[PDB]
From a paper:
A single amino acid difference was observed in the HA of each egg-grown [name]: Asp186Glu in A/Vietnam/CL1/2004, Val134Ala in A/Vietnam/CL105/2005, and Phe151Leu in A/Vietnam/CL2009C/2005 (H5 numbering). The effects of the single amino acid substitutions in the HA on receptor binding were also studied by X-ray crystallography of HAs in complex with pentasaccharides possessing terminal sialic acid (Sia) linked to galactose (Gal) by either α2-3 (LSTa) or α2-6 (LSTc) linkage.
Sialic acid was not detected in crystals of the Ile151Phe mutant HA soaked in either LSTa or LSTc receptor analogs. The structure of the mutant HA shows that the larger Phe side chain projects further into the binding site such that it may restrict binding. The 151Phe variant comprised 65% of the [name] population on day 7, increasing to 100% in the clinical specimen from which the MDCK cell isolate was derived on day 8. No other instance of an Ile151Phe substitution in the HA of [name] viruses has been reported.
Numbering used by the authors:
A (entry chain E), D (entry chain E), F (entry chain E): 5 to 325
B (entry chain F), C (entry chain F), E (entry chain F): 1 to 158
The structure:
């Protein structure tokens, strides 16, 4: 008559690592690392992302004629932009403090576009002629839709004194521009006046832009450059414009109605007609695991990213062969 | 095994004990079989479950990467930003992998300890009345019958 | 307890032993009482004291936050600075909390081990001359008198 | 006759956490986290902080007329500033590289103010008239005390050629300014000359400031703006000023005699008439614990900050019920 | 030692056993000497070797400092860069020093455990046939001759 | 007859630390921290570093006449520069975006210098006279070797319209400069024209530099300042220069043929005629240890830097006395 003490064995083939021993076979284990994603871009918690496609953030905000898909966009969860969007800055130039603006966009979920200065309001200057073959729309020469490229009228460009006050209760993103011609004759042709300036002011901003006339490489068939600036106009503050030429003027601005939780992710993927609670630039995660190894940049209710290929905890004991 | 029971003096586990993690095999004139020790098994289930939960939650406050962009003349701070994000990810990967490694070793030892203590509980009762075979088993001097077998598992014998 | 003594085969501790962490209860015709084992108690005091000191000093070289300010157009580096300061604080909080958790488990086990080794020291001497009850106690076969009791604690018996 | 092995129990109710078990009652424990502070702002190691109160760093350095409390301050341990000080930049404007200056202040414990250019030394320009209703002192129009707002004298503003050499053995903080008027008539009224500049130079600095005339929102009743600049003049270097208008000139500068260990903390708290070895923006710590959870930003001999609510080490054994 | 064998019930090690980490001393009419237990010694060599390798490689993905320069008016980001590089170096120094401390404690315990299990393997076989002296030694009741001594080490006795 | 269980002791004196006990003597241990270096600067994997000695990066790229040692340098592994090189910027001034350039150098192992604009090609301006006593070479007045200091010819400085296109398949580093005189008479003497500009343009750059005339401290006997700029000219892009004075013009530019793994280390050490696989600014490491405590900044196959004085693992057991 015998009584024996013993322990459970099973048909398990699950393995765990320890400091002293690798690949120990255990009766039970719990994998805690999520390795699968769905490879799509999805709605986040019901809310569709803003998928720019071929447009850049600059191309979207300024109103590149090829970016009409985004004339008025709904509330978004996150924004997706390609590494190298073709539709950006159709008339070549620079976008001043662009990355600081992009940063500010990561804390915004909704814009509402409002007209601050009507195209039909310019009396001493021409407003329908500021178009370019660099910015085509349907085969014809066009231009950024949210700003106005103003020219001289009847051989004169009187000094512009303009003013907007933010009636709205929301912060307002205001964009404007300056044209840097390639020669003195172009300056004459376009604006009449040889030496120009643009002065912009709010309660915080103290700005004067002077055009730079220089000869440069043709980008999209243009030797001119456009340089774009922005500011956030607080509530009940006013923005004062004064210019005598080279002025790319605001027609539209954006009211900010911002959820405040968002990101611009870089991805070549298109919309995947799916819903998820956790999105990466490579695909969405639906997991109950505490960790994942898909990609560092996620948004939503997400597992902790680690760089491991494998994370498995022992729960049971050393399985016997 | 630090405690010498699992794959030590008890050479291997039992496919026939499906009932729990640790238990007994008895053999006599009336027959033979397995019975799990529910108490130490449950003590083991709780310990391991809390451990997992502890592991999961201590790692719940971790570094989150945040998309951040820089122009062609901000290479230094871009690189700063790259080496910072990677630094933390490396720190946390290491933390995760090490905890798992260390705690896997502790879990295997924990089971080994539970088996040894269960062995000792039975040994301390049987005393003189059984030959300790040196394989996890006690051969009885006197006949033991199913109720006598309950008695050992019960903790009330003699 | 990994070692099976504390709240294992010895069901509970002694309110009546105020003298040290581990010791003996004796009972005979002359009476009964407690005596602490000063040597293993002191070995335990030193181990635990060094541990605390080690814990304290390994954490003495930690991250110090430094006030740092940025204008309205330096949001990216401000945020960089925020996520960096928080990253390290999280890393060190985690380190602190985990060390304490792991080392608390080791301290409880350490005490358990000291109790078991003290039990074994007494068992290895008594040998045949005492019935091992299975509760931390040895019932003597032959009468043992206070000087006989010193003898066991002394480590010189028979 | 029995001999038993056993272990200590007591009446302890102290609890510790482990990975496998929470709230284990132990006979002894050592709490290692300090959770208490005194809620005051105190002297550090005997040495009083500079508590700006309602003044900002800019308001203090420039000499805002409402910041007379800080005309000459003693050695300080740390500096305390409110989130939104009312007394800053009374005549509206910007403070160039302000945050870099604030950073430099964190490594300074003492300033000594010296006159570099006497108010009584301007011969061809008026010096007693540069005052403003934006910067009141005792009901009357006044101005920043450390700089001088110079106007034309007898319908003339001759070109200023000035020079200071740092005799002192200490680095010297020098502040100056420029006035940006709101219109051409104000430029005429104040300085006579229509187009102006200020050139500043040392061995390291190569500067020319051109005033920006623009119409903007009234801040404190002013549409003008002041723009302030600073530099550190090394020993035996000289600072050359040349201007023909819009010049806010240095009267005083600060000698740096810097301990080098300090910080600017943000707090709404007032002085607490106490002494301490460890100060946080929320209150002071007097503890022998290695860790604390009061606030990340401390100064002095301080415990390590952790974000824990609880850190308790087991010392004794598992206490029996 | 948590397991009570090394510098516990076995007071000290053997200068005379050069052959391996753990083994036996025998003494009889034919003479006396040492014999290492190659199996548990090798099990110990593998464990310790893997440990070192594990320690080495978990630390192979660490923070690398990258020279980075700033002008006289970039003090804030220079200081940011200084406090970031130092932060990680401190984190990794701490990780390195702590792992070594914790794993040194585990290695000493591991050896202690191997000695105790080897002691128990010999005890479980000798049984009644030997007086357990309480110092690591078993005095035989009956004469044991070199082949009888092989038998114990062999694991096949009686 | 006795059989005993026991364990190995030896004559070892090696010690390890544990949490509960310091200086435990063990039979065997493995030291894992490298504490020794050779104190020299060595070739890395056969490839000699560029040891600037007394020259700075600026002094080397611009062609400081005292830096002839580096007129044409071979492929390099790393670059070594002194804390305070004497030979930098011999004619005093600033180097625009210098640190961003230095950063870009850390990802470059080879330059090839090519002539983009020949000295012998200036027709309406003098090219052999732009020399200075600040930049001596062999006792005589000289100047930066890679750029050309152009003056008026026969009392005239016609407008410069120049252009270079990058034929090469490699990115090209192009350096140019501007002279800021100390007075109007110097402007007259040197360039004739009173008000000047330099316009520089590629497909990405839109630049116009205006000289700043101001009185300043003599540095190396000069009150003038030189201000240097750079750009990376992409393949098949062109660089357009237009100036009417104050132009320090490119004679040479650098083709980039970049390994991409390098660093600028700061060290006062000279070349050590040695080879190594791991270099620090203090000396080279030849070790099989996983960690070292020499210096944070290393290059090559290197151990992990830790700030420890000691890292020793136990392998054997507790040695008995
Ligand atoms: C902006 O317009 C609002 C609406 O009348 C006005 O109350 C506010 O004072 C204005 N702010 C200015 C003029 O700066
Ligand atoms: C500044 O003044 C001192 C005192 O004479 C003089 O030695 C030094 O050369 C001066 N530095 C200049 C003129 O830049
Ligand atoms: C640069 O020169 C090359 C060689 O002819 C030419 O193909 C390219 O178009 C030029 N780029 C310009 C003119 O911007």
């Amino acid at each position: 008559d015998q009584i024996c003490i013993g322990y459970h064995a099973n048909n398990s083939t699950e393995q765990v690592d320890t400091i002293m021993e690798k690949n120990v076979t255990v009766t039970h284990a719990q994998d805690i690392l999520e390795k699968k994603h769905n490879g799509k871009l999805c709605d986040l918690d019901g809310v569709k992302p803003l998928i720019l496609r071929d447009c850049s953030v600059a191309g979207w905000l300024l109103g590149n004629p090829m970016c009409d898909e985004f004339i008025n966009v709904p509330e978004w969860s996150y924004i997706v932009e390609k590494a190298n969007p073709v539709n950006d800055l159709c008339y070549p130039g620079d976008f001043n403090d662009y990355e600081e603006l992009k940063h500010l966009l990561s804390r915004i979920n909704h814009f509402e576009k409002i007209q601050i200065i009507p195209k039909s309001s310019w009396s001493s200057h021409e407003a329908s002629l500021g178009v370019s073959s660099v910015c085509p729309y349907q085969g014809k020469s066009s231009f950024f839709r949210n700003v106005v490229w103003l020219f001289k009228k009847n051989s004169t460009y009187p000094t512009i004194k303009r003013s907007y006050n933010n009636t709205n209760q929301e912060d307002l993103l205001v964009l404007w521009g300056i044209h840097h011609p390639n020669d003195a004759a172009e300056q004459t042709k376009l604006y009449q006046n040889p030496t120009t300036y643009i002065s912009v002011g709010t309660s915080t901003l103290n700005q004067r832009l002077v055009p730079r006339i220089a000869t440069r490489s043709k980008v999209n068939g243009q030797s001119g450059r456009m340089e774009f600036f922005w500011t956030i106009l607080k509530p009940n503050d006013a923005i004062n414009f004064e210019s005598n030429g080279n002025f790319i003027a605001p027609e539209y601005a954006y009211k900010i109605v911002k959820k405040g939780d968002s990101t611009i992710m870089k991805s070549e993927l298109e919309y995947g007609n799916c819903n998820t609670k956790c999105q990466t630039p490579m695909g969405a995660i639906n997991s109950s695991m505490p960790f994942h190894n898909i990609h560092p940049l996620t948004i939503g209710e997400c597992p902790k990213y680690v760089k491991s290929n494998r994370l498995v905890l022992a729960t049971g004991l050393r399985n016997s062969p | 095994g630090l405690f010498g029971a699992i794959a030590g003096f008890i050479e291997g586990g039992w496919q026939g004990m499906v009932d729990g993690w640790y238990g007994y095999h008895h053999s006599n004139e009336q027959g033979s079989g397995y019975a799990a020790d529910k108490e130490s098994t449950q003590k083991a289930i709780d310990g391991v479950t809390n451990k997992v939960n502890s592991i999961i939650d201590k790692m719940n406050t971790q570094f989150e990467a945040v998309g951040r962009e820089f122009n062609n003349l901000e290479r230094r701070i871009e690189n700063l930003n790259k080496k910072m994000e990677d630094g933390f990810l490396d720190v946390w990967t290491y933390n995760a992998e090490l905890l798992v490694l260390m705690e896997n070793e502790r879990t295997l030892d924990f089971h080994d300890s539970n088996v040894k203590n269960l062995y000792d509980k039975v040994r301390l009762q049987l005393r003189d009345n059984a030959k300790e075979l040196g394989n996890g088993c006690f051969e009885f001097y006197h006949k033991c019958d199913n109720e006598c077998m309950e008695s050992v598992r019960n903790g009330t014998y003699d």
